[PDB]
Amino acid sequence: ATFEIVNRCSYTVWAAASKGDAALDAGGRQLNSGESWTINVEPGTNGGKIWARTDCYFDDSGSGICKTGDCGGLLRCKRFGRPPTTLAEFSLNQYGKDYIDISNIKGFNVPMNFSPTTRGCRGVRCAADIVGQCPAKLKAPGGGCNDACTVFQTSEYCCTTGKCGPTEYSRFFKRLCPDAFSYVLDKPTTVTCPGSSNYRVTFCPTA
């Protein structure tokens, strides 16, 4: 499946694409404002994610650091990134269907639209000013708004017992972005698309 990743933000982002134990395509690339990066993702890929990283410095070997979403210091990510990261998540060709969603369970750093470019399903967006409105205790110095599991490490925010409810913190994310997951047991906002759909992820869809 092809994903076109477009940076509509006024600032540079370093896109990342991983399935947690391997890079997807090249794994990451710098995108200046306006630039688009087309990747191919193998059919059947389960648990893929795409995210943006902000304020990164990389050396000639592709080693360095980013203030949000850093994936162990690498330009080309093999592993998932450090929160806070707005996530576009997908599992492809799962019993004839693709499944996509946007999640704030690892916090929020950049607004995003995740939409098919082929027919048969709708896209999802989280474009609110979550960092501007972020409760004081979740603000990340690096930039971004952390989720409460990352900050407080409790069984209730991390849903570690498989039973947990919404919280003051998850309801903040949900109020601003109803179509994104706000906690691990949120009512699912997953969209089902035809198997082998193609997609576009756009950072800063409104700006």
Side-chain angles (χ1 to χ4, degrees):
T2 67
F3 281 75
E4 186 178 52
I5 301 174
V6 178
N7 179 22
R8 193 175 289 154
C9 300
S10 71
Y11 49 86
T12 304
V13 304
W14 283 263
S18 187
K19 63 176 188 77
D21 62 356
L24 299 178
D25 200 288
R29 216 200 81 177
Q30 184 177 321
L31 296 171
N32 293 142
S33 178
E35 283 193 327
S36 302
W37 173 36
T38 294
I39 64 167
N40 264 90
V41 176
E42 226 211 333
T45 290
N46 203 117
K49 304 196 196 290
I50 283 167
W51 69 100
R53 298 172 286 173
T54 60
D55 294 308
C56 301
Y57 294 83
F58 299 102
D59 76 6
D60 306 281
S61 84
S63 226
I65 181 128
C66 299
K67 296 216 180 166
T68 64
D70 188 62
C71 57
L74 294 176
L75 177 56
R76 299 177 169 195
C77 295
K78 281 151 135 110
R79 300 277 141 175
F80 296 136
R82 178 167 194 280
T85 51
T86 314
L87 291 170
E89 304 184 307
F90 45 90
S91 286
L92 310 180
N93 304 284
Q94 299 298 308
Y95 301 103
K97 290 300 163 192
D98 288 349
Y99 294 93
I100 67 171
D101 66 83
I102 289 179
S103 178
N104 286 140
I105 290 167
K106 302 282 211 201
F108 176 105
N109 60 157
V110 168
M112 165 197 291
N113 179 88
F114 191 5
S115 283
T117 55
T118 51
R119 42 199 18 68
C121 49
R122 48 118 103 163
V124 279
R125 174 172 290 193
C126 171
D129 187 17
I130 291 181
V131 170
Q133 298 301 0
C134 187
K137 289 178 181 201
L138 293 184
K139 276 193 224 181
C145 188
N146 284 311
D147 64 283
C149 169
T150 292
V151 177
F152 287 105
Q153 294 282 280
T154 70
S155 292
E156 192 64 13
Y157 292 141
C158 306
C159 288
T160 62
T161 75
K163 313 147 157 225
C164 60
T167 65
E168 189 95 296
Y169 295 120
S170 73
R171 284 183 183 99
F172 159 72
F173 290 95
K174 198 64 165 180
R175 171 169 68 77
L176 292 235
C177 281
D179 287 348
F181 279 87
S182 64
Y183 73 104
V184 168
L185 295 187
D186 203 347
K187 182 144 86 74
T189 47
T190 306
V191 172
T192 306
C193 289
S196 291
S197 297
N198 297 318
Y199 301 93
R200 180 182 281 122
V201 175
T202 304
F203 302 126
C204 305
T206 268

